[PDB]
């Protein structure tokens, strides 16, 4: 009777123990030095990490030489290096287990632009992303949680419609120009 999907799920999890001194500041260390909006994103990444940890644990307890263990073994690994959280020369799955959370955020577009220096002051980095001045290889994207693959690491540049790549200075540049041109001759 309906042609919709209803296929959706929660991307994050709530910590079991609220109001723990150790967890609160350690999380606050993450958002403060990564310029996140709330702890939901910190929980969102840890939930994704928990999943790839969970799958990798499943693969490991599965016996060697099983066709699915190898096939998914490369599949998980080949995509993680594609993200860039894993080094190309490491093809052993248990190094996913030792893999930590803070480097997934290193793959965020919010922090990538700051390290690339195009957007100083990582808090200033995220806003100009929302301001839609940063342009991926052939497209303009405003997503602070955008995760950049290795193939597109080098193609992060300011957009042409932004007033840092191409022309068209922004509206405050325009207003001070005309109020200047009216007050002088």
């Amino acid at each position: 009777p309906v042609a919709r999907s209803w296929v959706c799920r929660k991307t994050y999890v709530t910590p079991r123990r609220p109001f723990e001194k150790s967890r609160l500041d350690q999380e606050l260390k993450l958002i403060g030095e990564y310029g996140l909006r709330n702890k939901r994103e910190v929980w969102r990444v840890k939930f994704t990490l928990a999943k790839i940890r969970k799958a990798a644990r499943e693969l490991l307890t599965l016996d060697e030489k099983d066709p699915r263990r190898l096939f998914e073994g490369n599949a998980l690994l080949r995509r993680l290096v594609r993200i860039g959280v894993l080094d190309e020369g490491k093809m052993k799955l248990d190094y996913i287990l030792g893999l930590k959370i803070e480097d997934f955020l290193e793959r965020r577009l919010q922090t990538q632009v700051f390290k690339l220096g195009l957007a100083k002051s990582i808090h200033h980095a995220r806003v100009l992303i929302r301001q839609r001045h940063i342009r991926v290889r052939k497209q303009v994207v405003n997503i602070p949680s955008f995760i950049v693959r290795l193939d597109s690491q080098k193609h992060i540049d300011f957009s042409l419609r932004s007033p840092y790549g191409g022309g068209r200075p922004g509206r405050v540049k325009r207003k001070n120009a005309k109020k200047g041109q009216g007050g002088a001759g």
């Binding site: 606050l28 958002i31 403060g32 310029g35 996140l36 909006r37 709330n38 808090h123």
Partner: protein, 58 residues
Amino acid sequence: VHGSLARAGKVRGQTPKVAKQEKKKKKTGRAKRRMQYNRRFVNVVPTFGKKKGPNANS
């Protein structure tokens, strides 16, 4: 009944009415998550206080 429920809401009646005065609007969103992180994490003040507060009044 005792009729002693006439004392309902007495301490709200006798509470002197003082008002919320004009204060500066506090930052929200990520910005709120900015200032407290800077206030409580990278800060080296050279005094004592027995691990007092970020509003430190020892």
